[PDB]
Amino acid sequence: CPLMVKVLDAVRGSPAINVAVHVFRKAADDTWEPFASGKTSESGELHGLTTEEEFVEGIYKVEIDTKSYWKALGISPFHEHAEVVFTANDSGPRRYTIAALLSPYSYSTTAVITNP
Amino acid sequence: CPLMVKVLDAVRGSPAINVAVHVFRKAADDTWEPFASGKTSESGELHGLTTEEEFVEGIYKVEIDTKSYWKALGISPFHEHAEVVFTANDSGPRRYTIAALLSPYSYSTTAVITNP
Amino acid sequence: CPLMVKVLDAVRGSPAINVAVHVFRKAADDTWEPFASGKTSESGELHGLTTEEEFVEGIYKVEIDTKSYWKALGISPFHEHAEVVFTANDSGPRRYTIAALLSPYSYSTTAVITNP
Amino acid sequence: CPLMVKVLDAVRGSPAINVAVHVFRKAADDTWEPFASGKTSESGELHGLTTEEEFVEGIYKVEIDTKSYWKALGISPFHEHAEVVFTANDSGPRRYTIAALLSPYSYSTTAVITNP
Numbered sequence A, B, C, D: 001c002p003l004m005v006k007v008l009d010a011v012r013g014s015p016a017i018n019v020a021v022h023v024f025r026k027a028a029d030d031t032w033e034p035f036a037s038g039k040t041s042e043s044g045e046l047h048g049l050t051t052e053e054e055f056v057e058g059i060y061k062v063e064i065d066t067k068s069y070w071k072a073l074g075i076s077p078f079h080e081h082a083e084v085v086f087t088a089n090d091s092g093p094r095r096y097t098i099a100a101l102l103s104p105y106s107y108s109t110t111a112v113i114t115n116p
């Protein structure tokens, strides 16, 4: 599992469950070719997005549908979504966890990169 | 100013100076039109991007060039940029501060909104 | 002002108004002496806590009463308070902004330091 | 495992390894009785701090030795430590994860509470 996305809820103090996540890879014409997508689990985690051989170097975009998450909870959100754009495996492939901590008017995102 | 952008550096504990910022607005045909741009000052703040007349209802995108900021300090950061996308003035005119707190592998963003 | 405290609300996207703040300084016998206190203004800012003469080298503690803030909005938050402890003026006098961004189950804090 | 502490590094984009963590429970005289302690693993996590029967309702303090972590990496830090103070199991015991995302001049902390 070379790429995982984890989403947390700072209002409830819980994983953010059933959050839609879309991943894209930058094409040669600099438009976003869809790559993988899913919804976060009961633990706020989305596994199995890609494979070691498919996850080559390049620029990737992770789009987290924060607006729908807050709307489903009946809370007014600020952002249309939370986008995270990064370059992958530029010094070799590792395991990437892209985490996001969500509030209605603010979010925090980090990368936690480890080696197996 | 109806729209201000403020950028801080969590590694040095200081304003993030000379950070390029580009603002776009979503057009009726769903494309991103360039709206305003500038660089943060010595205080980390970017003022004067727009006017109350020009800053109509719409969906706006603030793109903060975090990568060039870190590269100039010798750091290869994780993110290509930090993008903040939001609906503005849905309930009438407001003043928006878009703040970002930067680390090489993480950032936080928040909105501070006041009613003039 | 050599020491300013700023508190923001990540749920409403606004300054956190009327937040009580207590400052302490570590004495030679390792106890915490009350140094200054106040409440955040309409802008979320607390100015006027100390003077350049009084704000000598030392270890300072800023205690932000986040619990009363959330309780007054009907929310039972996770944290009892947010405490920020730091050495000040180790390399000569500086101006410190201590910022906190509040959610019911999470907070972020940062220091913005400038040289007068 | 009713209580876990997880510490991340926003500069390196990695778990924060070998970070000292001390937990205390508030006594009746309002001083901090030590409760449990440990060091974070290769994954940034500290497990096994207490048991279901020992982790009763009360106010707990988690002290994360952020200063030593940054010093060992040769990086100037702002804070003396990161303290998280909270009330536990006030509506029944769950599983508490206390997470902290560290930068030299800033940190973010959240609670992720789940039920088994």
Ligand SMILES: O=C(c1cc(O)cc(F)c1)c1cc(O)c(O)c([N+](=O)[O-])c1
Binding pocket: B006, B008, B097, B099, B100, B101, B108, B109, B110, B112, C006, C008, C097, C098, C099, C100, C101, C108, C109, C110, C111, C112
């Ligand atoms: O967004 C923040 C912010 C972000 C965080 O992750 C943590 C935190 F304590 C504050 C911010 C906004 C502002 O308008 C502002 O002036 C400042 N400041 O002065 O330092 C900060």
Ligand SMILES: O=C(c1cc(O)cc(F)c1)c1cc(O)c(O)c([N+](=O)[O-])c1
Binding pocket: A006, A008, A097, A099, A100, A101, A108, A109, A110, A112, D006, D008, D097, D098, D099, D100, D101, D108, D109, D110, D112
């Ligand atoms: O990135 C974070 C994170 C972000 C913040 O703004 C503040 C903070 F304390 C942690 C994170 C990453 C993980 O992999 C993870 O498991 C968790 N967790 O379970 O709690 C959190």
